[PDB]
Nucleic acid binder design. Structure first.
Ligand SMILES: [Mg+2]
Ligand SMILES: [Mg+2]
Ligand SMILES: [Mg+2]
Ligand SMILES: [Mg+2]
Ligand SMILES: [Mg+2]
Ligand SMILES: [Mg+2]
Ligand SMILES: [Mg+2]
Ligand SMILES: [Mg+2]
Ligand SMILES: [Mg+2]
Ligand SMILES: [Mg+2]
Ligand SMILES: [Mg+2]
Ligand SMILES: [Mg+2]
Ligand SMILES: [Mg+2]
Ligand SMILES: [Mg+2]
Ligand SMILES: [Zn+2]
Ligand SMILES: [Zn+2]
Lengths: 68, 96, 114, 100, 55
RNA sequence: CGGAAGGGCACCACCAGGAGUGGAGCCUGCGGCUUAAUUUGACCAACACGGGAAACCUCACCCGGCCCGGACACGGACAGGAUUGACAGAUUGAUAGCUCUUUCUCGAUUCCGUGGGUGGUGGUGCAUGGCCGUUCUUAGUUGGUGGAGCGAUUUGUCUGGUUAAUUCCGAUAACGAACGAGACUCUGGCAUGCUAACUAGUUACGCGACCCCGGUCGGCGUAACUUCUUAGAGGGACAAGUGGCGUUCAGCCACCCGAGAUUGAGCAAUAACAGGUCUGUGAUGCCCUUAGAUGUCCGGGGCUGCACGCGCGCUACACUGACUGGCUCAGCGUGUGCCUACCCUACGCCGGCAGGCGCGGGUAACCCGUUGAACCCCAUUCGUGAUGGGGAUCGGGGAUUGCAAUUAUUCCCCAUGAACGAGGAAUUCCCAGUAAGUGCGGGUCAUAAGCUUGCGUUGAUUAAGUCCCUGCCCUUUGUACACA
């Protein structure tokens, strides 16, 4: 059957090259500094980092929002 | 089917400890009744054992709302290889 | 019984159970000349008798198929493990049993002969 | 002591045979036993259209299932009750045992 | 959340709640005496269940 | 097969009747109109049928939006990511991240293309199976041996009598048979004879209450029994007997004795239909869709729409009635569910009311329940007025169920107060506990009968016959038909 409204194209989620490398910072010595925050929730305790948006941080696993 | 690895392992281990496993032809089931320790929804059970039948490992029969799956020897060896098991162990349908 | 279901629907449920079991074995053992099922219901013990013709064929090698059928019945109907025992019997003068001869005639029809 | 056994069956002949056998066993053991009472028969009647579809003359079926229940009272130890009930039982009769 | 409303509609009653245990049909069913089966199935399995046309 | 002839049967035909329908309103179904859809099958043997009493689902149609629930095989895409989910903010209908910016994630299950599937209440019942309906629940059908015919075939299977019956007698080139019918099973009848009964009773005994020794108690306990109740084996009725008709055979009528001198239903067949079901199905061939889905899920609409016609039903048109109080009697059944989320109700409070609040009984001859049903019976009001008949239309308010009632689910109160003066042509069902009147169970059910399947109460007139009408069967005849 013919249509009038054009079909709603699916969301093409873009890829990120070496997205893991954007969490920490590179130093020549044997020390670690973490850039973004980490979710203090129960299921994701100390391994899963949080999002870094333009106005608030977010974790999707437990739906935790940290507004400014 | 985006079946979690945990659910797939649970289906395989239950199929290997009991040679058969039943499931009602009902996608709209919260969780499988035979195995309820973990979630492993009946939809995942049906599709996994459908896959086993499709690749010539299990045999399917139907009685009015349910499927019955019978695991052949060629499926036994495949399941053993997938789960990293020795040839010595056998399901309940083989030993006495 | 904790559920203490009434007898009026208990008999109906048992009859539906017999019909469901009969049709399930009819589909399963069609090649084996299955003729019917007799259920010997007792407290703590449930002996189910399968009347067929090729008893060795329906028993399978080392009883593997009857074993898995017992597991199928137990899992499907929720019976306690080990409560049900399947036994296979051969009907004397199987020519007089219409159902077995009907199944044989059906397989002869699909075989290809006139 | 005052044991009461209930027998529900679909076939009249089998149920009468079972009750006759049990009372004969009580007579052999010489136990005081109440007579075999007969509860009124339960007739589960269902009426349905013969035709799977709706066409044709309106013809209805009459499918009825008859259930008969008989209970017997005896005065004996529970071990005697289990011994008597464990033997000579037709598979088509459902058995219930009540102490009170 | 597709799963939040995929089957979220209540199925506590109505024709779509009860279905034939043999046909998965929602028409001509009988819930009396816990049959939960369509009239066609009941006629098919009347002899197996025990219903016999005595009269 | 006949648009020819002769016999036979049938309250789905008639005689006599009864109750009706068609006359009015309303419930429901069909056609038509209209509409995005007001989806669809069915059109004697369609039309209260699809057990189809649809707010949601059922739903198959339409208006929009998600998911893949596209197994498996082959070639790419990379643990320097294949790719699922994601509250904020816009958008929508929904907190569908379905979509647009913004990134955190899940952990080889996937994703991208190709074969191959898979699903469908999609079409095809004019391919089908099964089931069912109809012919026809009428009574018809077929061998063996034997006569006739060259043979296909025919007699048996019939001139008549009788029967519900090709059911029998009886003539007879036929004799023996078989299916059907019949027989049989279930159901009601009655047995003071048998077996039995605290999950049923009866009779007596003892207390308790009440009235002037006696009377009542479904008030409480116990010594006998199964008459009443329940359910098992048997009995019992067979045209058995008498008088008549009838070859004196079959069979029919009347009657005495007698629980009955025709209780009703089930299965019901060599055969046929291009009757219905592909929308009962994981029964199914072929075709079609298969990711912008004819698969599935969600929101909403519709299946009810109304200038009209037709069918199945309810209410009534009133004095044998309506209204208000009193008295009084049953049996059919069901009742806490596998998934299943939903049972039947006693009792005490609130209230006129539907209904609400609490502890109880019941998986049942145990509790509702001695099923205190109606009709009907008794006593007042109405006074021939479309009147206190009638309850259509309609407003306001009060409750229950459901996620949700608007197109008012259903229930209750006040009020508004339509047609209908017994209904033309035509036409339906029926003959004994029958019709009709009346009410009560089950199916549908979250809510529910104005349908159907059964049961109970009261309970009659006509009539023991026919082919006049209508059909339908047998025989005779005709045929250039034989996929008839
Ligand atoms: Mg339905
Ligand atoms: Mg007639
Ligand atoms: Mg209509
Ligand atoms: Mg119309
Ligand atoms: Mg639906
Ligand atoms: Mg549909
Ligand atoms: Mg899907
Ligand atoms: Mg090709
Ligand atoms: Mg299949
Ligand atoms: Mg869908
Ligand atoms: Mg009027
Ligand atoms: Mg109004
Ligand atoms: Mg007429
Ligand atoms: Mg001529
Ligand atoms: Zn977190
Ligand atoms: Zn069914």
């Amino acid at each position: 059957k013919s249509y009038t409204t054009p079909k709603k194209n699916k969301h093409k989620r873009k890829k990120v090259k070496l997205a893991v490398l954007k969490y920490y910072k590179v130093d020549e010595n044997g020390k670690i500094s973490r850039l973004r925050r980490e979710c203090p929730s129960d299921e994701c305790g100390a391994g899963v980092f949080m999002a870094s948006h333009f106005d608030r941080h977010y974790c999707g696993k437990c739906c935790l929002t940290y507004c400014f | 089917m985006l079946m979690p690895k945990k659910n797939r392992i649970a289906i395989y281990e239950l199929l290997f400890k009991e040679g058969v496993m039943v499931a009602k032809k009902d996608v709209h089931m919260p969780k499988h009744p035979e195995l309820a320790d973990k979630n492993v929804p009946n939809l995942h059970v049906m599709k996994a054992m459908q896959s086993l039948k499709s690749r010539g490992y299990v045999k399917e029969q139907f009685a009015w709302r349910h499927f019955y799956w019978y695991l052949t020897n060629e499926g036994i060896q495949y399941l053993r290889d997938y789960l990293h098991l020795p040839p010595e162990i056998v399901p309940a349908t083989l030993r006495r | 019984m904790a559920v203490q279901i009434s007898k009026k629907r208990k008999f109906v449920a048992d009859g539906i159970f017999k019909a469901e079991l009969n049709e399930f074995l009819t589909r399963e053992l069609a090649e084996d000349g299955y003729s019917g099922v007799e259920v010997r219901v007792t407290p703590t013990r449930t002996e189910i008798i399968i009347l067929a013709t090729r008893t060795q064929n329906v028993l399978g090698e080392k009883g593997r198929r009857i074993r898995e059928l017992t597991a199928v019945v137990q899992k499907r109907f929720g019976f306690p493990e080990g409560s049900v025992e399947l036994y296979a019997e051969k009907v004397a003068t199987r020519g007089l049993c219409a159902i077995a001869q009907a199944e044989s005639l059906r397989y002869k029809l699909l075989g290809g002969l006139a | 002591h005052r044991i009461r056994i209930t027998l529900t069956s679909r076939n009249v002949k089998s149920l009468e045979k079972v009750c006759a056998d049990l009372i004969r066993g009580a007579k052999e053991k010489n136990l005081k036993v109440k007579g075999p009472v007969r509860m009124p028969t339960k007739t589960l009647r269902i009426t349905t259209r013969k035709t799977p579809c709706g066409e044709g003359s309106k013809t209805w079926d009459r499918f009825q299932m008859r259930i008969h229940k008989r209970l017997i009272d005896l005065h004996s130890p529970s071990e005697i009750v289990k011994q008597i009930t464990s033997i000579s039982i037709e598979p088509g009769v459902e058995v219930e045992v009540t102490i009170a | 959340g597709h799963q939040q409303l995929y089957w979220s509609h209540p199925r506590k009653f109505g024709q779509g709640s009860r279905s034939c245990r043999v046909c998965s049909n929602r028409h001509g069913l009988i819930r009396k005496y816990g049959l939960n089966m369509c009239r066609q199935c009941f006629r098919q399995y009347a002899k197996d269940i025990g219903f016999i046309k005595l009269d």
